[PDB]
């Protein structure tokens, strides 16, 4: 019982790429994915609605659940949605945290979709692609390449 068109407006290209892309592609990719995590919500698309590359990004949710922890993530995501948060920072620690930074952000971007949560309409976004690095892109290609390419 649901009266709602399955919206897409699938702007993302590498969403369903299925295979490994360029360094320059993981650049836009993070923008696409973090936005796609949102589209599954706002438009209420599908999580399965994508390609191979994206499935691994989903696992960065998990890596974050492992790292930051489901508890913290739960507290954190919700914090984001009231426009008041907290957070610590990592840098040269672990690739695990590198990935974790994406998924933790991904859980936040999705959660907002239903009503377009943020409360603060201004500065509702910012560091999404800048939350990771071209250097991370290389790691990303590599991680994916394990099954990708």
UniProtKB/Swiss-Prot annotation:
Induction: Expressed in the early phase of the viral replicative cycle.
Residues annotated as transmembrane: none
Cellular component, GO, one term: host cell cytoplasm
GO MF, one annotated term: protein sequestering activity
GO biological process: symbiont-mediated suppression of host cytoplasmic pattern recognition receptor signaling pathway via inhibition of IRF3 activity; symbiont-mediated suppression of host NF-kappaB cascade; symbiont-mediated suppression of host TRAF-mediated signal transduction
Alphabetical list of Gene3D superfamilies matching this protein: dsDNA poxvirus
InterPro entries for the chain: Orthopox_K7 (IPR009174), Poxvirus_Bcl-2-like (IPR022819), Poxvirus_sf (IPR043018)
Cellular localization per UniProt: Host cytoplasm
Keyword flag Membrane: no
Keywords linked to the UniProt accession: Host cytoplasm, Host-virus interaction, Inhibition of host innate immune response by virus, Inhibition of host NF-kappa-B by virus, Inhibition of host RLR pathway by virus, Viral immunoevasion
Keyword Cytoplasm: no
Similarity comment: Belongs to the orthopoxvirus OPG044 family.
Subunit architecture: Interacts with DDX3; this interaction inhibits DDX3 and suppresses DDX3-mediated IFN-beta promoter induction. Interacts with TRAF6 and IRAK2; these interactions suppress TLR-dependent NF-KappaB activation.
Role noted for this protein: Virulence factor that affects the acute immune response to infection. Bcl-2-like protein which, through its interaction with the DEAD box RNA helicase DDX3X/DDX3, prevents TBK1/IKKepsilon-mediated IRF3 activation. Contributes to virulence by binding to the host TRAF6 and IRAK2 and preventing host NF-kappa-B activation.
Protein name, entry field: Protein K7
Source organism phylogeny: Viruses, Varidnaviria, Bamfordvirae, Nucleocytoviricota, Pokkesviricetes
């Amino acid at each position: 019982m649901a009266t709602k068109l399955d919206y897409e407006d699938a702007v993302f290209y590498f969403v369903d790429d299925d295979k490994i892309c360029s360094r320059d592609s993981i650049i836009d990719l993070i923008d696409e994915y973090i936005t796609w995590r949102n589209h599954v919500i706002v438009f209420n698309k599908d999580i399965t609605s994508c390609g191979r590359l994206y499935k691994e990004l989903m696992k960065f949710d998990d890596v974050a659940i492992r790292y930051y922890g489901i508890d913290k993530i739960n507290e954190i995501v919700e914090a984001m949605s009231e426009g008041d948060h907290y957070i610590n920072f990592t840098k040269v620690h672990d690739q695990e945290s590198l990935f974790a930074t994406i998924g933790i952000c991904a859980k936040i971007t999705e959660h907002w979709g239903y009503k377009k949560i943020s409360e603060s309409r201004f500065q509702s976004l910012g560091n999404i692609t800048d939350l990771m690095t071209d250097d991370n892109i290389n790691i990303l290609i590599l991680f994916l390449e394990k099954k990708l390419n």
